[PDB]
Structures are given as C-alpha cells and as structure tokens.
Structure 1
Amino acid sequence: EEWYFGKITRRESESLLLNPENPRGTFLVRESETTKGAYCLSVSDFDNAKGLNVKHYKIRKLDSGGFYITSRTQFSSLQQLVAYYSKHADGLCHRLTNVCPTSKEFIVTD
C-alpha cells in the first residue's frame, strides 16, 4: 500500500508525522531500524494538554504466518494489521486515518 515507508529512521518519521496538516491517526509503517526483522507502526496523536505528538509501536514477526502488536490480536499480513486498526482502535492511541506525506513541507487539499 502507500503506507509503507521502508527504512527511514525514528527521526525521519517523527518529522514527517509532525506536520500541522496531519489529522489525528495519520500513519506510517517502517522497518525496525537496527533491531531487525520487525516493524514499527508510527501514529500521529493529539491532546490539548501536550499537543502534537507521535507514538511508536512495534510490529512483531511471529516467525511464520503472522504479525502482531498485542498477543491478543493477531494478523496474517501487514495489510490485515493496517485494515483492522483503520476500523477499530483496539487500545491504540487512535484509529488509523491518513497515510503520511513525503514531505517538504506538504499542505493538504480539500
């Protein structure tokens, strides 16, 4: 899908996700820079107290037919992960919403 950002560092993802223009729930999926085989979901969040923030999530490889963040909720594929959390937040910070821009420094249409 568009959402797969390959191997940028935590930084380079934080700078993308910290764009004023991103809706809450904007995301990217990245490879696990220097701890590898795994992934990371990166989601922009917002609260009124602390403002724009972004949280990181490890996507574990079940060495198999499988990926998960929590043991309680498991997927066949990364597209199944993303399509689930797009519909239900299930204990993430927020539902998935936009895919992240690329960037420099991107303004969103209507």
Structure 2
Amino acid sequence: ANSLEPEPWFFKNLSRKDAERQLLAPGNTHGSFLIRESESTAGSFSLSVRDFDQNQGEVVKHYKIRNLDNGGFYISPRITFPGLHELVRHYTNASDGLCTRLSRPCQT
C-alpha cells in the first residue's frame, strides 16, 4: 500500500543480475538481502540473498515470492504472510528453510 518505497531492503526496477552485482558489492556478506519487483510483471517480487560461500567463491540465491489470491505472499507454502513486511521479519528471525537468515539490507 505504498509502504515499500521507504524500506531499505526494497529495490524498484532491479533485475536478477543487477541484484547479484548489488549483493556482491563491498559491504555485504551472508544474510545481506533485498526484495525486488520484477521489471516485466508489476506486483511479482523476488527475494535475493547473499549466501554462504561455495568453494571460496561468493554466492547469491534467488527465491520467487508468490502471490495469494487474498493478497498475501509466501516463499514456502508452509507459511504465508499478509505482506512483505511480515515476510521479511519472519525470515530475519530464522532461516526457516532459506539458505541463510536474513541479517542486513543490501548495502549500496
């Protein structure tokens, strides 16, 4: 309800690959995350998260945030949320199946 524009973790029109270079910029580590809106389909969001290193190389994972008919969102069908704000605080409390706990907004 326009409440995403002040969020430090929200990035408007940001592509998957721009999310990766953003999350690999200096100042980020595992847990660094952003939510981005898809550039083609307005209203469909992704979660991008700086993961644990693999084989001394940096890793960034991506998750589709899916849309409920009732307006809510979910990543895993085991737990659904009324908005992105509750989704973000839930995965900041625990990884709960994500590669890593959300720990810090992506630093620019």
5+ unaligned residues in a row in structure 1: which ranges?
Answer: 103-110
5+ unaligned residues in a row in structure 2: which ranges?
Answer: 1-6
Give the TM-score of the pair, scaled to structure 1.
Answer: 0.84
Amino acid at match of 2:38: S
Identity %: 52
Change (3 A) 1:48 1:9: closer
C-alpha separation between the residues in 2 aligned to 1:48 and 1:42? 17
| 8 Å Cα contact 1:17-1:44 kept in structure 2 | yes
Q: Structure 1 residue 58: deviation in Å?
A: 0.4
| 8 Å Cα contact 1:88-1:95 kept in structure 2 | yes
Give the TM-score of the pair, scaled to structure 2.
Answer: 0.85
**What CA RMSD, in Å, does the superposition of the two structures yield over aligned residues?**
1.5
> Which residue of structure 1 lines up, in the alignment, with residue 95 of structure 2?
89
Tell me how many residue pairs correspond in the alignment. Answer: 102
Query: Which residue, out of 63, 87, 91, partners 1:57?
Result: 63
C-alpha separation between the residues in 1 aligned to 2:54 and 2:101? 18
Structure 1 stretches of 4+ with a deviation exceeding 3 A read none
